[PDB]
């Protein structure tokens, strides 16, 4: 049993008002059963694409989620994960800086 690590980052340099892609890369977890949500202002984003589950040389699993987004001065984005290894869902917020 291993706890997921989460990293949140954009495909292109963020520019407010300009369409982009937000990535949520989830790694280092075991068992493979996982729930990954991407959130805009605390609400679930409906159209999120997931890579096929894979694993590394050390046997731990990883998965890439991504979604189209357009950064704005005030909108907040986050990736929230639920996994057997954690009593509480883990959330990491995108921080452009």
């Amino acid at each position: 049993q291993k706890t997921p690590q989460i990293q949140v980052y954009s495909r292109h340099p963020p520019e407010n008002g300009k369409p982009n892609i937000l990535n949520c890369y989830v790694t280092q977890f075991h068992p493979p059963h996982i729930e990954i949500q991407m959130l805009k202002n605390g609400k679930k984003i409906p159209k999120v694409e997931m890579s096929d589950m894979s694993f590394s040389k050390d046997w731990s699993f990883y998965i890439l989620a991504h979604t189209e987004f357009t950064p704005t001065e005030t909108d907040t984005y986050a990736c929230r994960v639920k996994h057997a290894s954690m009593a509480e869902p883990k959330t990491v917020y995108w921080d452009r800086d």
Binding site: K2, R11, H12, D52, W59
Partner: protein
Amino acid sequence: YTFRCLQMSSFANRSWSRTDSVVWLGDLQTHRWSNDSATISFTKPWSQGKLSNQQWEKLQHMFQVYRVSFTRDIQELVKYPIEIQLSAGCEMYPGNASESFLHVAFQGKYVVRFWGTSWQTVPGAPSWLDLPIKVLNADQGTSATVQMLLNDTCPLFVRGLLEAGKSDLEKQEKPVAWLSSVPSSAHGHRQLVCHVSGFYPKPVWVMWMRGDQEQQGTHRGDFLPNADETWYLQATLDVEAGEEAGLACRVKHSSLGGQDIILYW
């Protein structure tokens, strides 16, 4: 190039199990095989390599029989939640040399490999595996098939992939970089961040600079995948406020010709 076929099998109880597989050639996915699908799916134009439709169908049949047999054999052995992973393939070296491998993990831990002509437990693996592995080794049909796959079919198939997949494997995509900063935990210090995204292939060089002088405080992150078969990486530098002036981030990559990206803070 490391060609790897990854199997992920989960057994929740006597009547629930699933196995899913993915196949990679280096960092590019070439196949997927969902539990829900009778057949292996291609994720590239060149996923069949140089194999004929007959050779491909024969290979796929072998795997279809394996996927069923494997599930039955595990459920039989268990007389829960059980996770089994298998990684098999080959590393291709310069000059038509290769080395094949087949490793198995149980509950996230390496326990068994195929080596030479037989299945072997790894030192430290639980003792209850010794006898089932013995029995498995009595199956000479399976042992001979595995030997052929590893010694013969694997390197042959990969040579074809390398030809057929040339324009993807040899693609060059240019990094785009940008700079940001956050306050650091430590009064009067800032963390400068150089982001580098969209490059392929993976090898890249990224350094904070003061003129010609590399800043050895440069902390490179991990390589993170983008969803379009390109890479992302950032590198940070903790600086005293004031000392920020004169700093630049420099990036070197094969796709740039020989003109480095240099961004100035």
